[PDB]
Write a protein that binds this ligand. Structure first.
Ligand SMILES: [Ca+2]
Lengths: 194, 557
């Protein structure tokens, strides 16, 4: 049937998911994920949106600030709003798959709720597509792929110019932080392309 | 992050092999999630960080893919001009333009809420403001607006079935990431993916630029310029976050350099020499690299030269002679706590002294300390990520090559003294510190071993598990957080593809309310350290053969 999602876990607990369209396929993913790494993910959610102190308290305020200072939710919402339904199904499926398990967990806390939630004194809540996009956006984009030290570099340069003078200051800057180094081991041999 | 991909000509008893070691630190529960997807155009296996929709590490039966971090310069900083008579406005193309601003309130459990404003310009979010200079710093990202595009590109590549179809996705991936390809036919490929800015001529991308308009990006460069290679004459593709392509510029990070000294050369060296590699041998590169001292190769020549004319009894010589006796691979003793050889400790001490004497001494405070690190700095609980050649080492190395280096030495890092004099001074210091701890006989030095910790906090430093759940491995290993191998057209196996992975500490992070850990909470931890692996299953048959549990849901919308 086009209404079914099958779930098969191998020897080491690894889920394989079997389904006939995009929404149900990722709904399955969401479901097995909420079983395996609920908590890891709830906390990844909060990390990636700077909503950590909401439950862990005063210690994580600067972190929350830092995160939210470092993106613009509305851009992410606009991007999602501007997807096809086919693409939008991936996210909405995932979020609902997760939400389905959480409903069961908030229906059998005494047998299903991961201990951490009891230990850290809060309960999991429902996921929306924005939340699931941000797991990726707030890690892969906003951590890795978000590297500058251009301000520090300028500080360094001005300190070098002060000692050494202007022309030599820059020459030393080039010696410490070259743009490009001809002798660098490259993953694509020079015979093939520059 | 590392990877080696081995082509038809370089593979043995197979057509292609792809070995992938992404480095993101070590955590518990495991950083990546194991998942198989079957339906709606997808037939895939592997694993992926934070259970993203797209598998960053895996295969679909025909091809396989993977990633290492790119470190291209896809971020710049724009110096916005403001006026004291206009809060929230910046000058751009001769007119005063309004900043976007939102208000955020942070709810604090058992605490008073804090509210503040995020600002945003044309170029990006504001990262700092200097009222004194009337300037605001805005962070422009080439991938801005293409975040979810990139999420989706990761996913759709899983459907591709050849180089053309797959590169079409690669072009839609905007984050600065290295992408790797292998297939059943034994073709191998590489693409240094991402959006990268078309800069104005004269734009130095290591420093800020004015945001008043004339230095705005022209646009983005085309995918055509992104470095890429398909079936290279080398027979392999190897990467350890090193430069993708001759004359390609790296990230503007001061602490990051692609130069003469690069750890990828440790992989190159293993791979050259053996003309062909079976699967087992290709997976065994992990062990070899896991334990390789990265610095021995770079400095031992200078050390030998420097101590040749000393007496055989000079303790400085005893140190260098002992290093020369070493294969540069670290192993732990039976005590589970010290290294069989003392070579890393030696190099660390020497290099620390070496750097203070050269680079750091050439750089004004408080900046010199950016270059003071040897690369070995750790605690009981171990490094938190990969080991690498430090920035300072790399810069020193160029100085030791002298005329052999392409980088003009505007300052003589040796302060007009022979290199030899300094090298010895540093050896003296190392000998001084080490002998005081371990005594005067290098053969009786049991130096400390690096350990490994699976941390209960995620890389943000935010708890993702209880403190107790953190796990200790006796032996630190300069390897992937996970490892996976895909083998193509194995002449032995029936199936067209074989694939293995390892997801330590285990697939599940579930602990019941009564405290009972899942059966798959810890069951790959010992496998990890062992350099072991588990098989990855794709076909419905194989997945049925190794079932353990089965659930069926009726879903709709
Ligand atoms: Ca830059």
């Amino acid at each position: 049937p086009p209404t079914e999602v099958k779930i098969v876990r191998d020897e080491y607990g690894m889920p394989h998911i079997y389904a006939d369209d995009t929404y149900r396929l990722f709904y399955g993913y969401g479901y097995v994920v909420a079983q395996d790494r609920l908590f890891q993910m709830e906390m990844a959610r909060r990390s990636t949106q700077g909503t950590v102190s909401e439950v862990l308290g005063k210690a994580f305020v600067s972190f929350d600030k830092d995160i939210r200072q470092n993106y613009w939710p509305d851009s992410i919402r606009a991007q999602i709003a501007s997807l096809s339904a086919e693409d939008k199904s991936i996210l909405q499926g995932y979020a609902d798959g997760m939400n389905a398990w959480i409903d069961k967990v908030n229906a059998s806390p005494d047998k299903l709720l991961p201990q951490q939630f009891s230990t850290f004194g809060f309960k999991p809540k429902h996921w929306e597509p924005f939340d699931v996009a941000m797991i990726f956006v707030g890690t892969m984009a906003n951590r890795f792929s978000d590297s500058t030290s251009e301000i520090d570099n300028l500080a360094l340069l001005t300190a070098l110019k002060d000692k050494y003078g202007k022309q030599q200051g820059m020459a030393v800057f080039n010696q410490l932080k070259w743009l490009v180094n001809p002798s660098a081991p490259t993953t694509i041999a020079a015979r093939e392309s520059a | 992050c590392n990877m080696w991909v081995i082509g038809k000509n370089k593979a043995q008893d197979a057509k292609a092999i792809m070995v992938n070691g992404p480095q993101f630190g070590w955590y518990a529960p495991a950083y990546t999630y194991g998942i198989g997807l079957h339906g709606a155009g997808y037939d895939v296996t592997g694993n992926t960080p934070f259970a993203y929709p797209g598998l960053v590490f895996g295969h679909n039966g025909t091809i396989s893919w993977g990633s290492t971090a790119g470190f291209g310069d896809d971020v710049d900083i724009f110096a916005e001009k403001l006026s004291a008579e206009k809060p929230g406005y910046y000058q751009h193309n001769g007119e005063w333009v309004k900043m976007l601003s939102r208000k955020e309130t942070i709810a604090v459990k058992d605490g008073q809420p804090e509210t503040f404003t995020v600002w945003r310009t044309l170029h990006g979010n504001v990262i700092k403001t200097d009222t004194a200079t009337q300037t605001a710093y805005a962070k422009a990202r080439a991938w801005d607006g293409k975040e979810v595009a990139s999420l989706l590109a990761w996913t759709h590549q899983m459907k591709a079935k050849n180089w053309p179809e797959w590169t079409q996705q690669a072009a839609k991936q905007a984050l600065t990431i290295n992408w790797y390809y292998a297939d059943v036919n034994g073709n191998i490929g590489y693409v240094h993916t991402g959006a990268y800015p078309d800069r104005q001529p004269g734009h130095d991308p290591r420093l800020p630029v004015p945001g008043t308009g004339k230095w705005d990006w022209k646009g983005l460069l085309s995918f055509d310029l992104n470095p890429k290679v398909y079936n290279p004459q080398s027979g392999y593709i190897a990467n350890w976050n090193n430069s993708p392509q001759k004359d390609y510029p790296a990230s503007d990070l001061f602490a990051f350099l692609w130069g003469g000294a690069d750890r990828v050369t440790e992989i190159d060296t293993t791979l050259d020499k053996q003309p062909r590699f079976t699967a087992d041998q290709a997976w065994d590169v992990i062990r070899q690299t896991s334990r390789r001292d990265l610095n021995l190769r770079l400095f031992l020549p200078a050390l030998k030269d420097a101590t040749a004319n000393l007496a055989e009894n000079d303790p400085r010589r005893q140190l260098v002679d002992k290093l020369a006796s070493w294969d540069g691979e670290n192993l732990v003793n039976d005590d589970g706590k010290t290294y069989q050889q003392p070579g890393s400790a030696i190099l660390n001490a020497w290099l620390t002294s070496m750097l203070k004497r050269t680079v750091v001494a050439a750089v004004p405070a408080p900046f010199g300390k950016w270059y003071s690190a040897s690369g070995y700095e750790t605690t009981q609980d171990g490094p938190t990520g990969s080991l690498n050649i430090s920035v300072g080492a790399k810069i020193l190395y160029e100085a030791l090559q002298g005329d052999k280096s392409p980088i003009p030495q505007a300052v003589d890092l040796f302060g007009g003294k022979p290199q030899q004099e300094v090298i010895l001074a540093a050896l003296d210091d190392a000998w001084q510190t080490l002998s005081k701890r371990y005594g005067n006989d290098v053969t009786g030095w049991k130096t400390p071993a690096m350990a490994l910790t699976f941390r209960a906090n995620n890389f943000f430093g935010v708890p993702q598990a209880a403190a107790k759940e953190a796990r200790h491995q006796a032996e630190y290993q300069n390897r992937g957080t996970e490892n996976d191998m895909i083998v193509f057209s194995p002449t032995s196996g029936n199936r067209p593809v074989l694939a293995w992975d390892v997801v330590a500490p285990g697939q599940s992070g579930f602990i019941a309310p009564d405290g009972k850990a899942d059966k798959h909470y810890d069951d790959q931890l010992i496998m990890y350290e062992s350099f072991g692996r588990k098989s990855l299953w794709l076909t419905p048959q194989d997945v049925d053969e190794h079932k353990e549990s089965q659930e069926v849901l009726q879903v709709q919308r």
